[PDB]
């Protein structure tokens, strides 16, 4: 047992945080001591205060924390089977979840590879793509193509298709695989962008295993939105030039952008798909990589005869069980109307931010609200400003944004947006 002060002491000495230092943090992390529904209990000046989890804990907590149905699913599975190895054994949570995911994902994604994080699921997607073309007798097709502004995770192959600036590739000279980057995909649909992307792809087609993109929304690379019709064009380009299409839906999946999956906005299916973050409703790490029967059969028929990947905790019963509950909970309600209301709430509440001196854009897509500023947002100022108003917000770069739990009431959304609106005001000092 440790007090908040003791936690801070241990943390500062011994704990790495995401993209952080040891010993050079400008501000200490804030101690979290509970989470329930849409609210975190955090320690501020020795006192526990409840604040809205406007970030959904990095996109994960779509049903809120400690949802009784999700809690119950975990405890139920715990009493029967915590985990067995997936080498040579199978089980009901894996079967149930696989059945669900093949049913609700874009058409044609018939096989499911479970892994333990988004970054791994992306490396598995790349491995599927490369083994596929090797199974077609085309080992030269081994490079990846993407558009700038993207984020696909933190492992070294995942890093190679991250935005070169966002991903700090200048720090990684001579270390990463050299991939093919198209320019930043624009917000508004412009057929010339797609025509250009096609011409670039065409000259590399004999080298390319796959195009890998985030559909409709680019998350960690800048919270940018693009017209779904671009995805339609990619599916077409990939089809005609024989390059696989991979959609990374680790941030966009399970309703977040107003469709069940963001691909559904465009009405197209990728050859391979990754899901992750919200898969377990934010309870546990789990990810999945889906692919078509053709991809699966070609890999399996190749000289290698198998997909050469197998995580230790592949298809963990506990994580699978809570995911099944989380997916069913989403599907068992009018989620489409819920997200529409949230999007309306976000738009209404963020509207006055457009007139602010430091704001360059306000944009909303489903349960995603963004205020883009003209300068970097000072965390040392923004974080306590939002906490003062009962909201946990984590800006990055020039972005004040939120992806709130789907269970947030209108009053809660009013609270979140007011805090966001106030944070941007302080930005414009």
Ligand X SMILES: NC(=O)c1ccc(-n2ccnc2)cc1
User: Is residue 264 flagged as an active site residue?
Assistant: no
Is 258 a known ligand-binding residue? no
Kindly state the DSSP code that residue 28 receives in the 8-state scheme.
P
- Pick the closer one to ligand X by CB: 16 or 19: 19
Is 312 a known ligand-binding residue? yes
Please name the residue that has the structure tokens 């894996």: 94
Residue 248 interacting entry, from a copy of itself, ligand PLP, ligand X, none, C-beta within 5 to 8 Å by type: ligand PLP
- Cα angle at 321 between 33 and 288, to 5 degrees? 95
* Cβ proximity of 361 and 390 under 8 Å: no
Q: Which stretch binds Mg ion (CB under 5 A): 45-53, 80-88, 252-260, 330-338?
A: 45-53
- Pick the closer one to a copy of itself by CB: 139 or 410: 139
Residue 333 interacting entry, from ligand X, a copy of itself, ligand PLP, none, C-beta within 5 to 8 Å by type: none
Closest CA to 272 of 295, 252, 255: 295
CB of residue 199 vs ligand X: minimum separation in angstroms? 31
* Cβ proximity of 262 and 278 under 8 Å: no
Residue 263 interacting entry, from Mg ion, ligand PLP, a copy of itself, none, C-beta within 5 to 8 Å by type: none
Q: Which helix (H) or strand (E) holds 42?
A: strand 39-44
Is 394 a known ligand-binding residue? yes
Helix H segments across 373-427? 379-387, 410-427
User: Is residue 151 flagged as an active site residue?
Assistant: yes
DSSP letter for each residue of 326-372: HHHHHHTS-HHHHHHHHHHHHHHHHGGGGGSTTEEEEEE-SS-EEEE
Please name the residue that has the structure tokens 């101690």: 31
- Pick the closer one to ligand PLP by CB: 19 or 24: 19
Residues near 105 by beta carbon (within 8 Å), at least 6 away in sequence = 261, 273, 275, 290
Sites for ligand PLP among residues 299-318 (CB under 6 A):
311-312
- Pick the closer one to Mg ion by CB: 118 or 405: 405
Say how many residues touch ligand X, by CB under 6 A: 10
Is 39 a known ligand-binding residue? no
Residues near 365 by beta carbon (within 8 Å), at least 6 away in sequence = 216, 217, 225, 257, 258, 343
18 touches ligand X (CB under 6 A): yes
* Cβ proximity of 62 and 282 under 8 Å: yes
Distance of CA 333 to the CA centre of its chain: 22
* Cβ proximity of 402 and 412 under 8 Å: no
- Pick the closer one to Mg ion by CB: 50 or 154: 50
CB of residue 187 vs a copy of itself: minimum separation in angstroms? 26
First to last CA, the chain: 42
Is 221 a known ligand-binding residue? no
Sites for ligand PLP among residues 240-259 (CB under 6 A):
248, 250-251
62, exposed or middle or buried, with CB in 10 Å at 0-12, 13-18, 19+? buried
Binding mask of the shown chain, residues 63 to 102, with x at each position contacting ligand X by CB under 6 A? ----------------------xxx---------------
CB of residue 314 vs ligand PLP: minimum separation in angstroms? 8
Residue 87 interacting entry, from ligand X, Mg ion, ligand PLP, none, C-beta within 5 to 8 Å by type: ligand X
1, 13, 16, 19: residue in contact with ligand X (rule CB under 6 A): 19
User: Is residue 53 flagged as an active site residue?
Assistant: no
Residue 7 interacting entry, from a copy of itself, Mg ion, ligand X, none, C-beta within 5 to 8 Å by type: a copy of itself
User: Is residue 227 flagged as an active site residue?
Assistant: no
- Pick the closer one to ligand X by CB: 357 or 384: 384
- Pick the closer one to ligand PLP by CB: 158 or 359: 158
* Given 151, 230, 283, 406, the catalytic residue: 151
Rounded Cα distance between 146 and 182, Å, is: 6
* Given 227, 277, 283, 401, the catalytic residue: 277
Rounded Cα distance between 165 and 173, Å, is: 12
Closest CA to 368 of 321, 400, 398: 400
At 100 the three-state DSSP class reads helix
Just list the catalytic residues: 19, 151, 248, 277
Binding stretches for Mg ion (CB under 5 A): 50
Binding stretches for ligand PLP (CB under 6 A): 117-119, 122, 151-154, 214, 219-220, 248, 250-251, 276-277, 311-312
Binding stretches for ligand X (CB under 6 A): 18-19, 58, 85-87, 220, 310, 312, 314
Binding site residues, as ranges?
A: 58, 118-119, 151, 248, 277, 310-312, 394
């Amino acid at each position: 047992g440790l007090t908040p002060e003791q936690i801070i002491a241990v943390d500062g000495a011994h704990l790495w945080h995401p993209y952080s230092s040891i010993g050079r943090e400008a501000v200490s992390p804030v101690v979290a001591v509970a989470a329930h529904g849409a609210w975190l209990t955090l320690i501020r000046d020795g006192q526990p205060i409840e604040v809205l989890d406007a970030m959904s804990s990095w996109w994960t907590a779509i049903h809120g924390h400690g949802h009784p149905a999700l809690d119950q699913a975990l405890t139920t599975q715990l009493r029967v089977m915590n985990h067995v190895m997936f080498g040579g054994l199978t089980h009901e949570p894996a079967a149930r979840l696989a059945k669900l995911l093949v049913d609700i994902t874009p058409a044609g994604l018939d096989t499911v590879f479970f892994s333990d994080s988004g970054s791994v699921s992306v490396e598995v997607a790349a491995k599927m793509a490369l083994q596929y073309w090797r199974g077609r007798g085309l080992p030269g097709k081994r490079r990846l193509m993407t558009w700038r502004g993207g984020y696909h995770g933190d492992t070294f192959l995942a890093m190679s298709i991250c935005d070169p600036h966002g991903g700090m590739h200048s720090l990684w000279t001579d270390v990463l695989a050299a991939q093919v980057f198209a320019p930043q995909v624009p917000r508004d649909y412009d057929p010339a962008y797609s025509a250009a992307f096609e011409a670039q792809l065409a000259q590399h087609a004999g080298e390319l295993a796959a195009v890998v993109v985030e559909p409709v929304v680019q998350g960690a690379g800048g919270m940018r939105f693009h017209d779904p019709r671009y995805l339609h064009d990619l599916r077409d380009i990939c089809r005609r030039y024989e390059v696989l299409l991979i959609f990374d839906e680790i941030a966009t999946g399970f309703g977040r952008t107003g469709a069940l999956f963001a691909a559904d906005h465009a009405g197209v299916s990728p050859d391979i798909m990754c899901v992750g973050k919200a898969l377990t409703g934010g309870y546990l790490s789990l990810a999945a990589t889906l692919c078509t029967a053709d991809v699966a059969h070609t890999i399996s028929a190749g000289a290698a005869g198998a997909l050469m990947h197998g995580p230790t905790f592949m298809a963990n019963p506990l994580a699978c069980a809570v995911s099944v509950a989380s997916v069913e909970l989403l599907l068992g309600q009018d989620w489409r109307t819920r997200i529409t209301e949230l999007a309306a709430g976000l738009t209404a509440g963020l509207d006055t931010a457009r007139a602010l001196p430091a704001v360059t854009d306000v944009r909303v897509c489903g349960a995603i609200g963004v205020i883009e500023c003209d300068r970097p947002v000072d965390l040392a100022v923004a974080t306590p400003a939002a906490l003062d108003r009962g909201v946990w917000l984590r800006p990055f770069r020039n972005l004040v944004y939120a992806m709130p739990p789907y269970i947030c009431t209108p009053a809660e959304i009013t609270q979140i947006t007011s805090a966001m609106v106030e944070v941007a005001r302080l930005v414009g000092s």
